[PDB]
Amino acid sequence: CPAPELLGGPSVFLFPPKPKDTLMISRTPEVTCVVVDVSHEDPEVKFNWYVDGVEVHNAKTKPREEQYNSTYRVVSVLTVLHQDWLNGKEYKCKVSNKALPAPIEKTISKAKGQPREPQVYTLPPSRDELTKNQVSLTCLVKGFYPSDIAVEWESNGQPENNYKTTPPVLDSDGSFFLYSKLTVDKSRWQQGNVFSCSVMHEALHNHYTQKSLSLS
Amino acid sequence: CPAPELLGGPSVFLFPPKPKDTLMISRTPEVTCVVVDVSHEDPEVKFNWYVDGVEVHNAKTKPREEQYNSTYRVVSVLTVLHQDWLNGKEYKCKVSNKALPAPIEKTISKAKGQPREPQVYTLPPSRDELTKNQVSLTCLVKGFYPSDIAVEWESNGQPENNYKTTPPVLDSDGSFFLYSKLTVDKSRWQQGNVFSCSVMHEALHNHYTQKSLSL
Amino acid sequence: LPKAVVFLEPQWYRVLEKDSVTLKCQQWFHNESLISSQASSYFIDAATVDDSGEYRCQTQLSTLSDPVQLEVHIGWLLLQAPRWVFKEEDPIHLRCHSWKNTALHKVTYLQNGKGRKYFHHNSDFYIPKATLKDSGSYFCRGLVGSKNVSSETVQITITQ
Numbered sequence A: 001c002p003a004p005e006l007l008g009g010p011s012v013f014l015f016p017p018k019p020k021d022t023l024m025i026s027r028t029p030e031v032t033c034v035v036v037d038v039s040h041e042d043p044e045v046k047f048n049w050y051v052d053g054v055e056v057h058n059a060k061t062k063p064r065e066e067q068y069n070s071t072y073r074v075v076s077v078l079t080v081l082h083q084d085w086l087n088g089k090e091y092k093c094k095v096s097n098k099a100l101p102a103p104i105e106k107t108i109s110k111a112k113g114q115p116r117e118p119q120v121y122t123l124p125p126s127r128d129e130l131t132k133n134q135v136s137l138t139c140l141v142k143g144f145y146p147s148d149i150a151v152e153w154e155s156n157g158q159p160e161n162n163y164k165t166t167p168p169v170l171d172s173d174g175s176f177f178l179y180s181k182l183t184v185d186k187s188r189w190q191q192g193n194v195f196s197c198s199v200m201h202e203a204l205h206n207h208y209t210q211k212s213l214s215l216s
Numbered sequence B: 001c002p003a004p005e006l007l008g009g010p011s012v013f014l015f016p017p018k019p020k021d022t023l024m025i026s027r028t029p030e031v032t033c034v035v036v037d038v039s040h041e042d043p044e045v046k047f048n049w050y051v052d053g054v055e056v057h058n059a060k061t062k063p064r065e066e067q068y069n070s071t072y073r074v075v076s077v078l079t080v081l082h083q084d085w086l087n088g089k090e091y092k093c094k095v096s097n098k099a100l101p102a103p104i105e106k107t108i109s110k111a112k113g114q115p116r117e118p119q120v121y122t123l124p125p126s127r128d129e130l131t132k133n134q135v136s137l138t139c140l141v142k143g144f145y146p147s148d149i150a151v152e153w154e155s156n157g158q159p160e161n162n163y164k165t166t167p168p169v170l171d172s173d174g175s176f177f178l179y180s181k182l183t184v185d186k187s188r189w190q191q192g193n194v195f196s197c198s199v200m201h202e203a204l205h206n207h208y209t210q211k212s213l214s215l
Numbered sequence C: 001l002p003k004a005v006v007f008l009e010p011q012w013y014r015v016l017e018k019d020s021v022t023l024k025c026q027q028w029f030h031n032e033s034l035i036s037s038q039a040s041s042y043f044i045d046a047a048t049v050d051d052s053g054e055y056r057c058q059t060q061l062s063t064l065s066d067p068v069q070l071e072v073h074i075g076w077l078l079l080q081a082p083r084w085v086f087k088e089e090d091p092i093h094l095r096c097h098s099w100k101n102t103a104l105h106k107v108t109y110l111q112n113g114k115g116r117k118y119f120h121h122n123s124d125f126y127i128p129k130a131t132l133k134d135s136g137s138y139f140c141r142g143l144v145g146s147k148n149v150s151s152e153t154v155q156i157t158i159t160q
Ligand SMILES: *[C@@H]1O[C@H](CO)[C@@H](O[C@@H]2O[C@H](CO)[C@@H](O[C@@H]3O[C@H](CO[C@H]4O[C@H](CO)[C@@H](O)[C@H](O)[C@@H]4O[C@@H]4O[C@H](CO)[C@@H](O[C@@H]5O[C@H](CO)[C@H](O)[C@H](O)[C@H]5O)[C@H](O)[C@H]4NC(C)=O)[C@@H](O)[C@H](O[C@H]4O[C@H](CO)[C@@H](O)[C@H](O)[C@@H]4O[C@@H]4O[C@H](CO)[C@@H](O)[C@H](O)[C@H]4NC(C)=O)[C@@H]3O)[C@H](O)[C@H]2NC(C)=O)[C@H](O)[C@H]1NC(C)=O
Pocket: A004, A013, A015, A016, A017, A018, A021, A029, A030, A031, A032, A034, A036, A037, A067, A068, A069, A071, A073
């Protein structure tokens, strides 16, 4: 592709860590500063990172990546402390590039407002679905805040991956809810296996709760 | 790739009819052509409308309205025939204005692909929820395509006052699902009121089905 | 008796980094010093923030000129005017200057947070006849490519 004009120079998008990563200490939460519309001619990006206004120096610098539209995408990843993020510290990425008149600064932190504990409810298949060869196990998660949350499924100590989960939906009291749907072969349900919806959120005890569901 | 951008003049946005409007014959679906960033110096805007390429008239063009930012905004609304939209006819809005090197054309039409009928399942509150002042009634709608759909909750011939529906989510088999959550006082549930989840989709008979739910 | 006065070409005293300026003497003092050249006019090819500050001038036949302040700014956009206080019925000439004269489109000049004039392509906003209603804080904004940019505000005051 012939290079675009890029009159405005590059643009910056700053992304939060995955909810699960901030919640499990064995995991590594990262903030990601992405810079796009970097031109072939002025391709160098300089990153400065600040946590609550104090500079830090541990950022990792990724190799630029050629895009189809003949620009670079250029990224810096900063690993964060679990408690800093959850405590509402502000992460600032500052981006400097020759095509720009001044640096671009973007900041990100956890949504503000009183955290609220999710209620987790498992719902078995409809009598009506039981004529299909696969059935839907439903996990309803409601009344949470912030919207950052992770949901997985398990059975007999093993992960169950055949699931889809809706985005958080703002409910009418200012909290969020979502549904996760695990599809399993009916025979597995008929055998009496126990399936479990696992939910991770900052306002749950140990950041973790699990609700189970089986043939009754 | 070939995207040297139109830079400096009025912009056009073309909006589809509401799904429920295309599906129920007692409603009137419209395509909507919105033109923004019309200057005071050249405020005259011409609309042409094409259905599958056949110029139509009978569009209703509203008078231009001054915006807070001191531009003009002008809207043209084309009434659409239910079966025209569902059969996948294309609607083209063409916009002419002196500040435009060339007129601007926008097209829309129903998402393409083999229509698939939703399955609708109602799920009572979890036993664990029966402990709260309010309980959740769930309607699962899955297997549908395209994603255009309308879902409502009703009781005794009237809409319910407190439900939210998730956006459609793409399942692994290429179809969509969603959940709709109706919230009601526990008392209403346990007194055995009947609640109904109503679903409207291209691929249902009479474009309609409903399932009920009660203690 | 014969004093001196400085004149800027172009007239804008608020400029953007990389802007060309030309100062007219009617020897040069930058912040009260000297210069590499005591020619007739001091030429700045590509301003930087250090070029800001106070300029006076003086010639073999003429005394030390009045103080003339040059502000060099950093940004995408700068709202220029010949000055910021006007008499009723005065003409107010505003210019939404983009960094490096980069093409700017869909330009709005705002007064007190409200769009006052819109242009498809960058043009100056010229008010021929100032009134008291013209007082307030102005800025401009527009698109450079797909990027939406705005100038800092400036306060305009109208006197009777
Ligand atoms: C040339 O080609 C370039 C490459 O294609 C192209 O670059 C694209 O430019 C787009 C803008 O032109 C840019 O669009 C933005 O996208 C934002 C979301 O992007 C995510 O999701 C996309 C798909 O939906 C992905 O493609 C992106 O990669 C990105 O994906 C996320 O990436 C992060 C970081 O990797 C990742 O998190 C990290 O994951 C890793 C593991 O992978 C670790 O776990 C780390 O811990 C973790 O941090 C995410 O998981 C990943 N997500 C997903 C789903 O994959 C979107 O947010 C932007 O929208 C906002 O701004 C626009 C203004 O442009 C507004 O109009 C819009 O409404 C949004 O505004 C925001 O609204 C917020 C909500 O209220 C508000 O809070 C904000 O304040 C507000 N912001 C602003 C500024 O107003 C935007 O659409 C796109 O990302 C670029 N693509 C890529 C690949 O970078 C370029 O444009 C082309 N140029 C030309 C000239 O043609």
